[PDB]
């Protein structure tokens, strides 16, 4: 209850660069490194303003992988030693990233930390990840992870409350009383769901859904966490509250290690979602990533929504959604990479579609100006300004309103919207682990063979279709919001016809880049649209190739995924 404050004499570490996704490392070295944690966490703390700290609250929570709630308590001693007022944690130390956001938003937090590395691998051989929200509730943007980054490397002590422990399971208010402090530490222990849900609740009409979901004629669904944050929000919101059989909820046990697998929602990674629905029992599926805010859409059969259409089927038929009849659709956006979908329901329904380079900032910004309500990305993302990290139950929940008010399948409503707006056939090729001098020198080579003059109004064929270039530059973005100015973001090859080849180059890791091939190729033919994908996209792929040599200059003759 009472507990005494010291300071602990720290080294620095160099490379605690907190990033657009946090600061993500092997769980051993926050283990094996010496005040690792701890340096960091306090480098966060010490961008408040010390004066603002006794009124300032954190929410903290993760994603339920192994270290965790190690992290958790660290937070928790440093933010009481450094004058925080309060925490808001998550039961179990359990916040998804998008209950994060909703929490900081409605009870005006400074921020949250939130230990989560997404997507990728957990346990004791696992990765971890400590990512800082701000007020809005959403990532940290450059110019304080910057500062967090500076302090870091030249910190030299922290403060601790070393005899501070929580009890992260059990809900209600613990309160820490300092020695020679007069205020008190408090810590409030809340539902990992209630805060979520009660905002699902109102976002959506959940009669409406319950009648969906519940009795002899329901929709049938299997809704798979992949052993991460979501499940609790799955059993309790879509199974408890919504009616749906408790066998709806799949792998809904957060688990420290994810089962041993990566909380990464496709085709392959939740390839047993995918046989599950191959059966035929089922009307809808769902996977999602290990914070919640991504999600992949299925229907019957394993019929596979590629997120692009996805985004572009929730904007043609967004008024099923009670949230967005009330504030109206403010605008759409997507990423630049992601497909033209969207941009056809936008066009014809005639709303602003705002192309941003890849990151969240940019989605955001335009949120925080009133201007974007749908945003979707290919990597499996969507959201609307419901919050400020995108959602992946959410979607699922969009999804079922659409299918509740439409009253025909998945692929059925997918079949119609190609009708309607024609079909951007997509698909993304990663190239991994490729060398990063030839990958570089692929795209400056393409980059320049772009901006000669004589490129656009090139012709392509093969084998049936002749392709002109419309445009072809490296993409660059001026945010109305922000005014800041991202350069490089891609080199686009555009066809007259409205499809696309995009060319983007990670950076350099330890074991090389990653070359991302987006292909986009449009169909309005009824007698090409419903025909199968990598076949309608061969042609483009092969120009793609060509134009970049990629075989000559990585020496790779296949993608080493394709999605
Ligand atoms: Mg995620």
């Known amino acids: 209850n009472m507990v005494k404050i010291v300071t602990v004499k720290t080294q620095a570490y160099q490379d605690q660069k907190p990033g657009t996704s946090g600061l993500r490392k092997r769980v051993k070295v926050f283990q094996s490194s010496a005040n690792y944690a701890e340096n960091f966490i306090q480098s966060i703390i010490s961008t408040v303003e010390p004066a603002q700290r006794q009124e300032a609250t954190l929410v903290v929570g993760g994603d339920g992988r192994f270290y965790m709630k190690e992290a958790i308590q660290l937070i928790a001693r440093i933010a009481a030693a450094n004058g925080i007022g309060r925490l808001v944690i998550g039961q179990n130390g359990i916040l998804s990233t998008p209950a994060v956001s909703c929490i900081i938003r409605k009870i005006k937090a400074i921020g949250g930390i939130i230990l989560t590395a997404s997507h990728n691998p957990g346990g004791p051989n696992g990765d971890f990840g400590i990512k800082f929200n701000i007020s809005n509730g959403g990532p940290?943007?450059?110019?304080?992870?910057?500062?967090?980054?500076?302090?870091?490397?030249?910190?030299?002590?922290?403060?601790?409350?070393?005899?501070?422990?929580?009890?992260?399971?059990?809900?209600?208010?613990?309160?820490?009383?300092?020695?020679?402090?007069f205020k008190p530490f408090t810590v409030e222990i809340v539902d990992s769901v209630e805060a979520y849900a009660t905002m699902l609740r109102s976002i959506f009409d959940f009669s409406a859904l319950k009648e969906l979901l519940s009795g002899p004629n329901r929709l049938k669904i299997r809704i798979d966490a992949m052993h991460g944050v979501v499940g609790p929000y799955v059993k309790k919101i879509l199974c408890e509250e919504l009616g749906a059989p408790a066998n709806s909820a799949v792998n809904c046990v957060p688990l420290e290690d994810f089962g041993g697998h990566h909380p990464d929602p496709n085709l392959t990674?939740?390839?047993?979602?995918?046989e599950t629905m191959k059966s035929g029992e089922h009307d809808f599926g769902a996977a999602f990533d290990g914070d919640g805010d991504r999600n992949m859409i299925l229907g019957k059969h394993g019929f596979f929504v590629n997120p692009s259409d996805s985004v572009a089927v929730i904007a043609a038929n967004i008024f099923s959604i009670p949230y967005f009849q009330q504030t109206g659709v403010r605008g759409f956006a997507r990423s630049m990479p992601t497909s033209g979908a969207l941009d056809r329901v936008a066009s014809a329904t005639k709303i602003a579609l705002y192309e941003t380079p890849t990151g969240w900032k940019f989605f955001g910004n335009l949120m925080d100006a009133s201007k974007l309500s749908l945003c979707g990305e290919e990597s499996f993302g969507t959201g609307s300004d419901?919050?400020?990290?995108?959602?992946?139950?959410?979607?699922?929940?969009?999804?079922?309103?659409?299918?509740?008010?439409?009253?025909?399948?998945?692929?059925?409503?997918?079949?119609?919207?190609?009708?309607?707006?024609?079909?951007?056939?997509?698909?993304?090729?990663?190239?991994?682990?490729?060398?990063?001098?030839?990958?570089?020198?692929?795209?400056?080579?393409?980059?320049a063979?772009?901006?000669?003059?004589?490129?656009?109004?090139?012709?392509?064929?093969?084998?049936?279709?002749?392709?002109?270039?419309e445009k072809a530059d490296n993409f660059e973005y001026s945010d109305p919001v922000d005014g800041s100015i991202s350069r490089n973001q891609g080199?686009?090859?555009?066809?007259?016809?409205?499809?696309?080849?995009?060319?983007?180059?990670?950076?350099?890791?330890?074991?090389?880049?990653?070359?991302?091939?987006?292909?986009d190729s449009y169909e309005k033919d009824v007698a090409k649209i419903n025909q199968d994908p990598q076949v309608m996209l061969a042609?483009?792929?092969?120009?793609?190739?060509?134009?970049?040599?990629?075989?000559?200059?990585?020496?790779?003759?296949?993608?080493?995924?394709?999605?």
Not at 449 to 469: C, E, H, I, P, W
Not at 540 to 545: C, G, Q, R, T, V
Request: hydrophobic share 40%; net charge neutral.
């Open 386 to 447: 419901h919050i400020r990290e995108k959602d992946g139950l959410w979607a699922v929940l969009a999804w079922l309103s659409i299918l509740a008010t439409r009253k025909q399948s998945v692929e059925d409503i997918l079949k119609d919207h190609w009708q309607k707006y024609g079909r951007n056939f997509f698909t993304r090729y990663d190239y991994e682990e490729v060398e990063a001098e030839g990958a570089n020198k692929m795209m400056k080579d393409l980059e």
């Open 269 to 274: 990674y939740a390839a047993d979602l995918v």
């Open 539 to 563: 042609p483009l792929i092969s120009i793609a190739l060509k134009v970049s040599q990629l075989q000559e200059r990585t020496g790779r003759t296949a993608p080493t995924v394709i999605t």
């Open 491 to 519: 080199l686009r090859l555009i066809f007259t016809d409205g499809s696309r080849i995009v060319f983007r180059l990670s950076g350099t890791g330890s074991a090389g880049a990653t070359i991302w091939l987006y292909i």
């Open 140 to 181: 940290a943007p450059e110019a304080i992870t910057d500062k967090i980054f500076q302090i870091s490397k030249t910190i030299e002590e922290y403060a601790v409350c070393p005899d501070l422990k929580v009890d992260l399971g059990v809900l209600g208010k613990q309160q820490f009383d300092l020695e020679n402090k």
């Open 449 to 469: 063979l772009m901006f000669d003059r004589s490129f656009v109004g090139k012709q392509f064929s093969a084998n049936d279709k002749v392709y002109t270039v």
